[PDB]
Amino acid sequence: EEPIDIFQAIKEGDYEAVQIALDRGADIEQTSSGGVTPLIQAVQCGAEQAVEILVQSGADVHAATRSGDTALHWAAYGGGGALVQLLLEAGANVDAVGDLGNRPLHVAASRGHDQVVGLLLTHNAHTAFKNAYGNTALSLATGAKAQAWIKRVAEGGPGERSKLAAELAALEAEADAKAAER
C-alpha cells in the first residue's frame, strides 16, 4: 500500500490516517521543505486530535522550524487554549526561544491571545524576558486586560500565577456551564 502522507492526512483532518502512518512507520519527526514536523503542522492546522495522536506516538514537543518557531509558538499564533494546554502538558518549553528571541509568552501577547497568555503565565512564562527588538511581553500585549495580567505576573510571581490559574479555571467552568445550559 502507498505510504500515507501524514502531512496531507493532518491537513485534511484524517486522524485515523495519521495513526495508520505512524503505525506503519512514517517518520514522526519528518521535516517538510520548511522544516515543519507533523506535530507543528497539526498545531498550525488546528487538528487537536492529530496533535495528541502525535504526542502519544512520540512527536517532539520542542521541535522547531528553521526559523526557531516551535509547535508551542504556532499554537500561540492559533490562539487555541486547548492546543496550548495540550503542548504544555506534553512538555513544550514555556519560554522557548523562537525566531529572534521570541518566546511563547511574547508571541501570545503580540497577538493578544488572552487565553494563551494566561495559560503560559500559569505555566510560569516570565514577563521580564526581552526579544531581539527591545520589547517586553507587556509591550507586546495588545489588549489592556492581557497587559494587566502580564504586569501583575511581573510583580506577583508564582503566587499570582496560582491566583491566575484559579481564575482561569473559574472562567473555564463558567463557559462550560453556559455551554451546558445552551
Partner 1 sequence: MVDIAAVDETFKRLQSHKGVLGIIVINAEGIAIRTTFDNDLTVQYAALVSHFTVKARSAVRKLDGDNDLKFLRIRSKKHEIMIAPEFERSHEYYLVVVQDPSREA
Partner 2 sequence: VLDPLLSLRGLPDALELMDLAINQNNYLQQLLLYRDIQPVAESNWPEELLQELADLGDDAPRMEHLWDWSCPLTAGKNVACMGWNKANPDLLAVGYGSEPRGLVAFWSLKNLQHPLWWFEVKAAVTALDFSTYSPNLLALGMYDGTVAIYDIKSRQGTPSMESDVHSGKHSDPVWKVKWLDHGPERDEPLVSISTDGRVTQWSIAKG
CA neighbor of 71 nearest in space, from 17, 85, 129, 4: 85
The string of DSSP letters for 105-119 reads HHHHHHHT-HHHHHH
What's the closest the beta carbon of residue 101 comes to partner 2, in angstroms? 9
Positions in 140-159 near partner 1 (CB under 8 A): 140, 142
What's the closest the beta carbon of residue 100 comes to partner 2, in angstroms? 8
Residue 55 contacts residue 19 (beta carbons within 8 Å)? no
The torsion of the CA quartet 141, 64, 8, 86, rounded to 10 degrees, works out to -60
Site size toward partner 1, by CB under 8 A? 25
Positions in 83-142 near partner 1 (CB under 8 A): 99-100, 102, 106-107, 109-111, 131, 133, 135-136, 138-140, 142
Angle between the N-to-C axes of helices 114-122 and 144-181, in degrees from 0 to 180, rounded to the nearest 10: 100
C-alpha cell at 74: 504556532
Residue 140 contacts residue 170 (beta carbons within 8 Å)? no
CA neighbor of 50 nearest in space, from 108, 3, 80, 77: 80
Picked from partner 2, partner 1, none, the partner binding residue 177 (CB below 5 to 8 A depending on kind) is none
- Report the distance separating Cα 61 and Cα 58, nearest Å: 9
Q: Which is nearer to partner 2, 57 or 135 (CB)?
A: 135
Positions in 130-169 near partner 2 (CB under 8 A): 132-134
What's the closest the beta carbon of residue 128 comes to partner 2, in angstroms? 16
Picked from partner 1, partner 2, none, the partner binding residue 33 (CB below 5 to 8 A depending on kind) is partner 1
Query: Which residues here bind partner 2, judged by CB under 8 A?
Result: 132-134
Q: Rule CB under 8 A: which residues touch partner 1? A: 32-34, 36, 44, 67, 69, 74, 77, 99-100, 102, 106-107, 109-111, 131, 133, 135-136, 138-140, 142
